[PDB]
Amino acid sequence: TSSAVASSGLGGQQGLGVLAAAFAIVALATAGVVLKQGDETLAQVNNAYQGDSLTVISSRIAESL
Amino acid sequence: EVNIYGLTATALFIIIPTSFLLILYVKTAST
Amino acid sequence: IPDEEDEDLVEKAKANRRARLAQQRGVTRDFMASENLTDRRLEQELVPVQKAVYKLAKSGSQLESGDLKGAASTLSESWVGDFSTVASTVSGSTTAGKLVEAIKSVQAAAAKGDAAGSKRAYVSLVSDLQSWADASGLATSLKGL
Amino acid sequence: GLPWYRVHTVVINDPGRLISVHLMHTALVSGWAGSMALFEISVFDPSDPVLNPMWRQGMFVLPFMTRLGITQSWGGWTISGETATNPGIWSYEGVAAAHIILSGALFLASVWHWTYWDLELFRDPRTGKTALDLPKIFGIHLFLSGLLCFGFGAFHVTGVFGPGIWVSDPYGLTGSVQPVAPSWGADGFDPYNPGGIASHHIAAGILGVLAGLFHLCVRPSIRLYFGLSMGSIETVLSSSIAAVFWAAFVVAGTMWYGSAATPIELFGPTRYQWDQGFFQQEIQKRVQASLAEGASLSDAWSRIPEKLAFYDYIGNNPAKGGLFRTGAMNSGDGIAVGWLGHASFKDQEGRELFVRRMPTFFETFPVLLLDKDGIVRADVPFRKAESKYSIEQVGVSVTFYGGELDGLTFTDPATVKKYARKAQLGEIFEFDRSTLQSDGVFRSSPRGWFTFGHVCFALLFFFGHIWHGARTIFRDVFAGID
Amino acid sequence: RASTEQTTKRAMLGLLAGAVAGALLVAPAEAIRIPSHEFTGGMVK
Amino acid sequence: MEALVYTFLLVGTLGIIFFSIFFRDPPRMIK
Amino acid sequence: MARPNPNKQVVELNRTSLYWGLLLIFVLAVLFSSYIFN
Amino acid sequence: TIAIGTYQEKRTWFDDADDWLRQDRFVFVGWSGLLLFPCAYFALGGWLTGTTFVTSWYTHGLATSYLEGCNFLTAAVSTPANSMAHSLLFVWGPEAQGDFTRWCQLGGLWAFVALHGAFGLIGFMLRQFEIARSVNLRPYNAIAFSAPIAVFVSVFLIYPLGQSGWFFAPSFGVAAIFRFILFFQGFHNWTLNPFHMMGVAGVLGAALLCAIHGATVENTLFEDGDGANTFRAFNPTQAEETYSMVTANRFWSQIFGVAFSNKRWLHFFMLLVPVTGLWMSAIGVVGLALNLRAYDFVSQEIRAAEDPEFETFYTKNILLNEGIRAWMAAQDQPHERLVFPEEVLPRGNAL
Amino acid sequence: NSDFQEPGLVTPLGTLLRPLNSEAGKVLPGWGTTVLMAVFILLFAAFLLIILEIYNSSLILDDVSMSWETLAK
Amino acid sequence: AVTPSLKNFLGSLIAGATVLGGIALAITAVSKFDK
Numbered sequence A: 001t002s003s004a005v006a007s008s009g010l011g012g013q014q015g016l017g018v019l020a021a022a023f024a025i026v027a028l029a030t031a032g033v034v035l036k037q038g039d040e041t042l043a044q045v046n047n048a049y050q051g052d053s054l055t056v057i058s059s060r061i062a063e064s065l
Numbered sequence B: 001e002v003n004i005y006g007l008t009a010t011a012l013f014i015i016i017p018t019s020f021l022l023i024l025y026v027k028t029a030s031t
Numbered sequence C: 001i002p003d004e005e006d007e008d009l010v011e012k013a014k015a016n017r018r019a020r021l022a023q024q025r026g027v028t029r030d031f032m033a034s035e036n037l038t039d040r041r042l043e044q045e046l047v048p049v050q051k052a053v054y055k056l057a058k059s060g061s062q063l064e065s066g067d068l069k070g071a072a073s074t075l076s077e078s079w080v081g082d083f084s085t086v087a088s089t090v091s092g093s094t095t096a097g098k099l100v101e102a103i104k105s106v107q108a109a110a111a112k113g114d115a116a117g118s119k120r121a122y123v124s125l126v127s128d129l130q131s132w133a134d135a136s137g138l139a140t141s142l143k144g145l
Numbered sequence D: 001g002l003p004w005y006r007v008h009t010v011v012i013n014d015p016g017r018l019i020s021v022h023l024m025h026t027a028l029v030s031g032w033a034g035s036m037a038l039f040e041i042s043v044f045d046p047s048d049p050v051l052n053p054m055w056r057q058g059m060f061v062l063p064f065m066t067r068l069g070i071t072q073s074w075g076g077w078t079i080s081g082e083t084a085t086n087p088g089i090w091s092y093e094g095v096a097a098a099h100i101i102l103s104g105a106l107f108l109a110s111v112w113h114w115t116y117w118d119l120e121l122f123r124d125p126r127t128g129k130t131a132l133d134l135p136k137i138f139g140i141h142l143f144l145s146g147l148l149c150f151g152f153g154a155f156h157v158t159g160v161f162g163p164g165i166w167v168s169d170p171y172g173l174t175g176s177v178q179p180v181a182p183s184w185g186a187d188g189f190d191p192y193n194p195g196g197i198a199s200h201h202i203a204a205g206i207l208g209v210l211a212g213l214f215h216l217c218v219r220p221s222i223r224l225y226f227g228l229s230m231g232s233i234e235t236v237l238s239s240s241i242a243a244v245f246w247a248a249f250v251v252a253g254t255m256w257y258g259s260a261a262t263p264i265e266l267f268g269p270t271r272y273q274w275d276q277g278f279f280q281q282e283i284q285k286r287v288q289a290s291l292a293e294g295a296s297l298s299d300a301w302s303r304i305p306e307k308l309a310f311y312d313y314i315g316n317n318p319a320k321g322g323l324f325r326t327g328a329m330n331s332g333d334g335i336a337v338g339w340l341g342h343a344s345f346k347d348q349e350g351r352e353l354f355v356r357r358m359p360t361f362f363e364t365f366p367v368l369l370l371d372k373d374g375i376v377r378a379d380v381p382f383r384k385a386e387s388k389y390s391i392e393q394v395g396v397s398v399t400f401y402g403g404e405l406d407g408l409t410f411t412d413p414a415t416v417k418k419y420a421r422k423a424q425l426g427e428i429f430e431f432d433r434s435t436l437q438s439d440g441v442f443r444s445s446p447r448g449w450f451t452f453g454h455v456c457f458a459l460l461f462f463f464g465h466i467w468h469g470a471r472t473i474f475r476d477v478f479a480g481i482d
Numbered sequence E: 001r002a003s004t005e006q007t008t009k010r011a012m013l014g015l016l017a018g019a020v021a022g023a024l025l026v027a028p029a030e031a032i033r034i035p036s037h038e039f040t041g042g043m044v045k
Numbered sequence F: 001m002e003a004l005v006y007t008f009l010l011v012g013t014l015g016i017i018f019f020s021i022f023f024r025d026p027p028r029m030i031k
Numbered sequence G: 001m002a003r004p005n006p007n008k009q010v011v012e013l014n015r016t017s018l019y020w021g022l023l024l025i026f027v028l029a030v031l032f033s034s035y036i037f038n
Numbered sequence H: 001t002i003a004i005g006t007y008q009e010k011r012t013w014f015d016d017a018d019d020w021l022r023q024d025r026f027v028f029v030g031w032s033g034l035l036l037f038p039c040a041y042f043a044l045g046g047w048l049t050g051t052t053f054v055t056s057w058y059t060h061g062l063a064t065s066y067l068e069g070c071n072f073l074t075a076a077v078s079t080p081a082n083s084m085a086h087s088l089l090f091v092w093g094p095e096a097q098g099d100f101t102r103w104c105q106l107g108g109l110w111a112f113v114a115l116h117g118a119f120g121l122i123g124f125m126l127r128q129f130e131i132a133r134s135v136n137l138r139p140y141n142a143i144a145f146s147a148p149i150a151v152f153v154s155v156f157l158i159y160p161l162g163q164s165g166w167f168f169a170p171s172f173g174v175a176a177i178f179r180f181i182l183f184f185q186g187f188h189n190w191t192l193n194p195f196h197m198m199g200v201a202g203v204l205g206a207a208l209l210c211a212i213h214g215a216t217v218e219n220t221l222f223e224d225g226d227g228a229n230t231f232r233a234f235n236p237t238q239a240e241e242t243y244s245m246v247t248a249n250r251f252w253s254q255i256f257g258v259a260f261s262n263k264r265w266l267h268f269f270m271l272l273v274p275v276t277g278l279w280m281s282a283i284g285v286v287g288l289a290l291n292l293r294a295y296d297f298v299s300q301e302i303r304a305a306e307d308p309e310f311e312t313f314y315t316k317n318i319l320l321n322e323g324i325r326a327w328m329a330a331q332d333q334p335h336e337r338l339v340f341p342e343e344v345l346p347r348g349n350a351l
Numbered sequence I: 001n002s003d004f005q006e007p008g009l010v011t012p013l014g015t016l017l018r019p020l021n022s023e024a025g026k027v028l029p030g031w032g033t034t035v036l037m038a039v040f041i042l043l044f045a046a047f048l049l050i051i052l053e054i055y056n057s058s059l060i061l062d063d064v065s066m067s068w069e070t071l072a073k
Numbered sequence J: 001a002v003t004p005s006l007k008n009f010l011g012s013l014i015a016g017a018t019v020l021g022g023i024a025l026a027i028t029a030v031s032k033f034d035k
């Protein structure tokens, strides 16, 4: 009966809980990896276009006075 | 005093094994 | 075995090693650009400064005319902090402090009356920023994207 | 009365004492890691990251921390040569202190498990005698190892939660710690592709889990149980020795030949880059491209970064070294301080001469200035030997392009001879030799020492595997029983 | 140019080689094998 | 300093040889 | 402090083993000292 | 409970195969045979073919074959060219492209022989284990053979793997091995390595032990035969040993100073000395594979450079190594394309 | 001795983990699942050969370049 | 694409499988004949 109890315990716990935890972790991680590889590959910051003026001319505007 | 680290290495290599062996021999000889 | 030689200009090379290290950044960047590779190491910490310099240049251009008081509004739209932290990374708590002091001072001067004092502070800030860029060795990369 | 070499076998039966012993070994290794981290941080000189990198200062565990994302330090400096303002909890000192604390905690746990050796957990319900269910223990441990491997591959290297790993350009000029998106195609199996790492640590990871599950739920066959003697703890020792043996060769080979896990910017260049003229070819291609674009030779040679030229120097070759030439590379030929420049040799006729570079084998190599056709045109006699082609006679002159000696020229035979002897080693460089009292003999980089140590350990562990497998299969004969 | 210059010595040497080889291969094998029968013929394993 | 170390090591080896020759444990196990 | 461990033997080292060990260490030192000192 | 013993189940194909393999015939095949007999066979075959027909003209620029006019001492199976750095040189690989003639010309026969020989060594060690298990004996022969297999693995696989390619591995020949030895002397100063010193001590001490043990056993024999020849006065089924341990112990204790008093310890010492020596040699050659050679004695070099009037035998050995390297590199390494003029070749009269 | 010299110490973690170390020695009849092990060993050997030949340049694929130059993507 | 080297490697796998199968069939046939 020692092995009977061991078999019941393993078939329950190491047959359900381990599978559930492994599947949950694997699904979470793989979903995150796929989402971040297919959606966000480069960092985007700032916006707007600007090339009209450069600092040199603006500095040259206010040294006479 | 040339190659202080070399002298230290040689001294330790001669002392630690020698002390270990002598301690073991004394410990067993009491039997 | 190789002999001593090496004369005595080793002191000359060792004394001004920081300047050569700073200047080598531009050479490395040009090498990468010609090789058609991506630095992906210094360009990331440089885009925030690039945007900062563009925004400051526009602030100056639209403040010199004195046609808009919003200079102060756009001056501190959560971009000065990024420039300050990256500058401290490059230099650290000594030049970055001066740059943040100058930028806050010019912002205050513009917000007060946009008087001649604000323009003088802006000119001093531009000169200091140019000198800092020259010293840091990035001067060849800031301008013209 | 056990002999001195059969002493530890007193722990071969009781699992509690075995656990205590293993905890002590783990504590010792972790403490060593922390202590070396602290020692190298104390000895490290971070001022110059271009001509005085980690691999030139003899650092060993610092590159292994940097390869996974540790860059800053509490001293204010960074491995990049910049300055850090908010180092955070995870710095070199923080990692070392963490390892030391773990060593102490493991020591306390070891003494506890040594004191309370007799636990009901180690006695099976039937026959009430000490026993370990090795297949199920292996299943649990494999499940955990696969889970950790998958976590590392999908959360640390890929950067979704972690910092990433160290990726660099082919020539090791600009590298840093970045996320590594997995690569699944056939390009994920060449080890110079960092992506192949991440993908691996996912795939294998998952399999581990599955394998673990199997080994938890399926018992070994009786034929396999008796064939491999799965009831004894010595067969597992033999197999584990074989596994670490195999891993030791694999890692030594990857370190020696190079991989995406051993960047040249942390461990230094490999000898196969010097043998095949990797950096030399790149420098020449860039100079020729600049010349074709149209520019002065001095200008063309002044656009090559000092780092690339430094890689093109035989002193950085891990092959050039000695078994008892102890210490860092800086202590062999001095601390590099600057790049003199590219030396071009021209005879009186006008045709350019090129110095024959020293092959890796030769401890000392004669200097031969030869033209573009491979014909020897000048050299230095062995030692006060009768000369027919000599620097004095042929009258070669050396002109320097780029570097500190940019545009200068020399004609006196003594300086041309000295620079010709310096040139066979590769790119000329300038060395401060009075700081570390460097003797003048080349030392080996961390690559060489790592490879040597791990291959030696691999051979010794092959012998250990043989011995322990023999003592497993022949257990009855060794014990003199039925 | 390389080519054998001897015509009929091949057969004369081959006959002797075969005749000698037969005996020289059967005899030592016999000498070594008889003890092998003796050892594996009642006291083995 | 190196000469003294070498001489000490050689003298130690000679002394060990002498002690093994003359102060050995008696071989009554088989005799 | 739970129960004396039955698996408690003692290491024993006869004189010949001591001489062998001392000779080994001293001879290795003789061989490697010149290399260590360079 | 449902207990079980050993071999209480139905028979299987594995049982029949095992029974056939482990029979009692002239040659014990065993399972290891399936790995040993083919591989080793080919190895030998390869070498013989290699030493009889193929040439190393296109690999080393040499002529090493009986068909080209070479002795038994000069014939060899030369290593491939340095261009094929570490290619395993499969017949179907990108180099040979499936052409057997070009495969032989490229030097792939050396790789064939080396790999098949390594696996033959593995099979032989497994065979020793299997025989010992079959006759219920401790497999110390397996360790004694772990020594030479370690030496072979080091020299023939780890050294070339750490170098630029197979070209610098030993070539299977007498003069080839002599070239290998002189190359190590010239380029690595292998004689000055502490590990070759340990190996030399081990090997010479093993020879000394063999000779002394044989002489002592043959000269302390017990008189158990009337005839003047002592070889027939012995049968394998004896009870007592055939030599007097007491007399030998006293003799070697009065002549030398120390003597053995235990057969097991004596024979284990005989086993131990060569194995340790060869393992140390293997470690040394592993070190050499990365050019981590014992060459410098930096203090001596500095002192010699400072004043020319200081010459020790070490300096003379260094000069001899310089000569060896300079005069050998021209032809021993054709891929370098080295042309040393007579002016720059090292010479004694130029000192 | 009686029950291997009286029962051992009992701890909450010991009782929690006892099931994982109770069925020691249990085996399946016959060869069990050794054939699957052989199949997986053969597949693993093929995989190791593939990677070794890719890393030895004895197996050139289109996608892989097998040199430092692949670090520039 | 299937490069020629890949085709040769696959052929090598096939040939080695054939050799192992030949050894297995030899031992099987002889063992069955003798038992």
Ligand code: CLA
Pocket (backbone or CB within 6 Å): B009, B010, B013, D039, D040, D043, D057, D058, D059, D060, D323, D324, D325, D326, D327, D328, D445, D446, D449, D450, D451, D453, D454, G028, G029, G032, G033, G036
């Ligand atoms: C495989 C592991 C490994 C590797 C690859 C390295 C590699 C390195 N270490 Mg580290 N180290 C290690 C383990 C390792 N170490 C351990 C376990 C310790 C703790 C003791 C240290 C402590 C340590 C310090 C304190 C220092 C280094 C330094 C170095 C560098 C210089 C080369 C060297 O070690 O000296 C050359 C190696 C040798 C001379 C050893 C020769 C090996 C032979 C085979 C041993 C033979 C022993 C012989 C039987 C007995 C001789 C007796 C004789 C002494 C009388 C190099 C980067 C130095 C450095 O530059 O760092 C900044 C330095 O200062 N290491």
Ligand code: CLA
Pocket (backbone or CB within 6 Å): D004, D005, D006, D007, D008, D009, D012, D237, D241, D460, D461, D463, D464, D465, D467, D468, D471
């Ligand atoms: C996973 C690794 C591992 C483990 C757990 C063991 C465990 C064991 N071995 Mg095995 N062994 C190993 C690796 C390992 N060995 C390797 C790699 C080799 C090849 C050299 C051997 C060769 C070997 C032999 C030949 C024998 C054993 C024996 C033993 C048992 C007694 C330990 C002993 O020698 O007394 C304790 C030994 C000492 C106190 C002496 C230590 C002095 C050493 C030589 C120098 C100092 C080492 C240094 C401080 C640390 C080096 C670190 C390095 C490993 C990185 C024990 C079960 C013995 C046994 O039971 O068989 C009957 C035995 O005869 N082992």
Ligand code: CLA
Pocket (backbone or CB within 6 Å): H034, H035, H038, H039, H088, H089, H090, H091, H092, H108, H111, H112, H113, H115, H116, H119, I042, I043, I045, I046, J010, J012, J013, J014, J015, J016, J017, J019
């Ligand atoms: C047991 C005996 C044995 C052993 C150990 C070896 C071992 C070796 N031989 Mg030798 N050889 C042998 C017998 C043997 N051979 C015989 C009998 C012959 C005569 C026919 C030869 C003729 C021969 C030649 C002519 C050559 C070798 C070579 C080699 C080497 C390359 C091995 C290789 O890639 O093969 C292939 C290895 C395998 C196929 C491993 C088995 C993997 C199986 C098939 C997996 C199957 C699972 C699955 C279906 C695969 C899925 C993937 C895909 C199909 C989808 C290696 C050292 C070569 C070499 O390196 O020389 C330098 C070489 O040129 N051998």
Ligand code: CLA
Pocket (backbone or CB within 6 Å): H121, H148, H149, H151, H152, H154, H155, H180, H181, H182, H184, H185, H189, H190, H191, H196, H199, H200, H203, H204, H277, H278, H281, H282, H285
């Ligand atoms: C007193 C002089 C002396 C002595 C005693 C030695 C002793 C030794 N030297 Mg040498 N050496 C010396 C001077 C000396 N050296 C000098 C002055 C030089 C110049 C530098 C060298 C250069 C040198 C080199 C370059 C090498 C040695 C090596 C060795 C070791 C050889 C181990 C061995 O058996 O390998 C030979 C045995 C094998 C390779 C094992 C393979 C055996 C296979 C399985 C048998 C194959 C079956 C075969 C077909 C059956 C046919 C049998 C038939 C022949 C009857 C040994 C310790 C070698 C060594 O061990 O390094 C690790 C080595 O590589 N030495």
Ligand SMILES: C=Cc1c(C)c2cc3nc(c4c5[nH]c(cc6nc(cc1[nH]2)C(C)=C6CC)c(C)c5C(=O)[C@@H]4C(=O)OC)[C@@H](CCC(=O)OC/C=C(\C)CCC[C@H](C)CCC[C@H](C)CCCC(C)C)[C@@H]3C
Pocket (backbone or CB within 6 Å): H040, H043, H044, H047, H113, H114, H116, H117, H118, H120, H121, H124, H141, H144, H145, H147, H148, H172, H173, H174, H177, H274, H275, H278
């Ligand atoms: C010159 C050195 C040397 C040689 C040639 C040698 C040879 C041999 N020793 C054997 C055994 C041993 N040797 C032992 C200890 C030692 N052996 C040593 C040194 C040697 N031992 C040393 C120094 C030790 C002390 C540790 C032990 C303990 C054993 C044994 O148990 C064993 C035995 O039973 O001896 C009677 C035999 C192994 C048979 C074999 O290869 O299996 C079959 C495998 C084969 C044939 C594959 C080898 C293929 C090789 C690698 C390819 C090259 C073959 C060409 C012919 C090379 C020619 C090279 C030219 C230079 C001539 C063989 C007769």
Ligand SMILES: CCCCCCCCCCCCCCCC(=O)OC[C@H](COP(=O)(O)OC[C@@H](O)CO)OC(=O)CCCCCCCCCCCCCCC
Pocket (backbone or CB within 6 Å): H091, H092, H097, H098, H099, H100, J004, J005, J007, J008, J010, J011, J012, J014, J015, J016, J017, J018, J019, J020
């Ligand atoms: C099934 C094999 C039956 C035996 C074949 C004859 C064996 C004797 C060969 C003597 C050399 C003659 C040239 C043959 C070589 C040859 O002509 O190959 C040619 C063949 C096809 O190449 P192709 O000529 O089609 O290539 C032409 C171009 O497309 C190349 O780019 O390559 C293969 O497919 C592999 C053949 C392996 C043949 C060797 C069999 C042994 C394999 C290794 C066994 C390992 C066992 C490991 C067990 C663990």
Ligand SMILES: CC1=C(/C=C/C(C)=C/C=C/C(C)=C/C=C/C=C(C)/C=C/C=C(C)/C=C/C2=C(C)CCCC2(C)C)C(C)(C)CCC1
Pocket (backbone or CB within 6 Å): D028, D029, D031, D032, D035, D100, D101, D103, D104, D105, D107
């Ligand atoms: C308790 C504790 C603590 C502390 C602790 C500590 C602090 C520790 C330390 C520790 C340590 C500090 C450790 C160390 C260790 C070391 C080692 C373990 C070493 C080893 C070595 C070796 C092993 C070597 C080897 C060798 C050599 C010598 C060289 C080469 C060769 C050979 C390899 C042989 C505290 C209070 C905080 C809290 C609570 C816990």
Ligand SMILES: CC1=C(/C=C/C(C)=C/C=C/C(C)=C/C=C/C=C(C)/C=C/C=C(C)/C=C/C2=C(C)CCCC2(C)C)C(C)(C)CCC1
Pocket (backbone or CB within 6 Å): H041, H042, H044, H045, H046, H048, H049
């Ligand atoms: C082709 C090939 C192969 C195979 C091969 C083989 C397997 C071979 C074998 C071979 C063999 C198996 C050979 C043998 C040989 C032998 C010889 C060559 C012998 C010689 C002898 C002698 C020379 C002697 C002498 C003498 C004597 C002893 C007597 C008298 C005296 C004298 C001294 C005269 C294969 C396809 C796989 C792959 C590829 C390659």
